[PDB]
């Protein structure tokens, strides 16, 4: 069980860790988050009480280093940093635990939500989507744009998701125009799975990361990307049997975890109605269709 200590909390902020969150008051004696489950990526994230504009946060994996948070009054945000001195850190953490100034990552033992939302998400792939190789952790916020969004402006601050475009030469074999447009299996299985992602695990990891950035930061380009990766599978007539089964599990936990009060912006009517009711895989998403119907029958 690992720990992310905080130097202090000088400004009032709502702090999230994965799907959990708590309110910290201005200069309340908060000094971090303990008992963080090892073996998964995690995201710590922030919404200042004053300017709810800009949700922002940090993706990280405690196996790759000791990380802490410290507020910067110049740049006006809680920054993640790496401590390179092991004994300094354990001592900080031990002293902070001794005075019980840390919250406990509040995981129910019965609960596999986080595992299921991050099953295929690896820090190595996050660090390629979010480029900043001088840090072992990755910053993301509400406003960051995707590579594909910038094509249609600061590259160092972009989300380098894989570009998907259904009316593109990469998507459409010369001579198979109608075939490839109406059945995207070529583009899914040859171009993307075999060519770009190499395997479905890496495809699912990007899909899941894109969803998580859409949900936790309201990142619009991430939401676009999540839906495009769903549509590309649902619009392929030929999908490996294991991918279809796993996709249903993946989407199920994403829709289960979505705030009920956010489905107006984060869910694309056209994509879901096509995916569940008109596409090749309309019948292969029983659990996802089931929870979408009992929970968001309005959108449909």
């Amino acid at each position: 069980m690992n720990t992310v200590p905080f130097t202090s909390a000088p400004i009032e902020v709502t702090i999230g860790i994965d799907q959990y969150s708590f309110n910290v008051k201005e200069n309340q004696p908060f000094h971090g988050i303990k008992d963080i489950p090892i073996g998964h990526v995690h995201v710590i994230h922030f919404q200042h009480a004053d300017n709810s504009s800009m949700r922002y946060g940090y993706w990280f994996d405690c196996r790759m280093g000791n990380f802490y948070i410290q507020y910067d009054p110049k740049d006006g945000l809680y920054k993640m940093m790496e401590e390179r001195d092991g004994a300094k850190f354990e001592n900080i953490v031990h002293n902070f635990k001794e005075r019980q100034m840390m919250v406990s990552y509040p995981k129910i033992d019965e609960d596999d939500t986080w595992y299921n939302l991050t099953e295929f998400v690896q820090m190595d792939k996050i660090r390629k989507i979010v480029r900043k190789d001088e840090n072992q952790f990755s910053y993301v916020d509400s406003s960051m744009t995707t590579v594909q969004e910038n094509e249609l402006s600061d590259p160092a601050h972009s989300l380098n998701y894989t570009v998907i475009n259904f009316k593109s030469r990469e998507a459409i074999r010369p001579g198979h125009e109608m075939e490839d447009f109406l059945d995207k299996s070529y583009y899914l299985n040859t171009v993307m799975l075999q060519g770009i992602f190499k395997n479905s695990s890496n495809y699912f990891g990007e899909l899941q990361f894109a969803f998580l950035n859409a949900m936790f930061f309201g990142n619009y380009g991430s939401s676009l990307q999540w839906h495009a990766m769903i549509e590309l599978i649902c619009s392929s007539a030929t999908v490996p049997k294991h991918m279809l089964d796993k996709l249903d599990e993946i989407l199920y936990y994403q829709i289960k975890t979505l705030p009920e009060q956010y489905s107006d912006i984060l869910l694309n009517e056209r994509v879901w109605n096509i995916c569940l009711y008109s596409s090749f895989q309309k019948n292969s998403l029983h659990n996802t269709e089931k929870i979408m119907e009992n929970k968001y029958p309005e959108l449909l």
Binding site: K167, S168, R169, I172, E177, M178, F181
Partner: protein, 237 residues
Amino acid sequence: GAMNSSNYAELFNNDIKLFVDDTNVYRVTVHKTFEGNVATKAINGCIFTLNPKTGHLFLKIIHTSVWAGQKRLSQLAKWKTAEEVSALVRSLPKEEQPKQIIVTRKAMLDPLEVHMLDFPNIAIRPTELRLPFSAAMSIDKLSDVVMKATEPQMVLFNIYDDWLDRISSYTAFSRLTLLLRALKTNEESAKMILLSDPTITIKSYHLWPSFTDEQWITIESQMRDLILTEYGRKYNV
């Protein structure tokens, strides 16, 4: 963007453009099987591809053999249309290729866009105008060459005959759309107006009769009456 009443003069500027109408590509005569069920039999069709400034019609005849053993023909027809239009553009010299293609039905947008991915700077546009190009098969010489085709075949016509010697493109397009709108609303009466007078002939190399300017005004008037009338016979006004 979309083409409408507001930007109508753009059709006659000096940027090459083509209208593409697919309404006569897939044509059937639905009938009854011996078992009392219903079958379609296809007949030959055509793509109607028109330069509105010059009057150049590229009439691609769609022979019924193209449908043999195919499924979902109404959907295939849009993709076949797009395949043929893209092939036409590729066949033209660069300086003759259009800058824009305006499809008369929105269902042609994605098929044409996908076939023209090699041509990123050719704009594919829909229109809000309800143009009467379906009625092209009411022009006897066009109907005749489509029905007689025994193989795929491109036929090249000026749909304005020699009108551009005497009138502008704007005026020629307006005359064309009035004639076709009339043929579409009451083909029989429309053809009566055009052929009523045995002294007026159609040149072997033309589609429409050789009317003087004054006779064209009389004809055009008679065509407007018909279109209003039929608007009253249908709407009882």
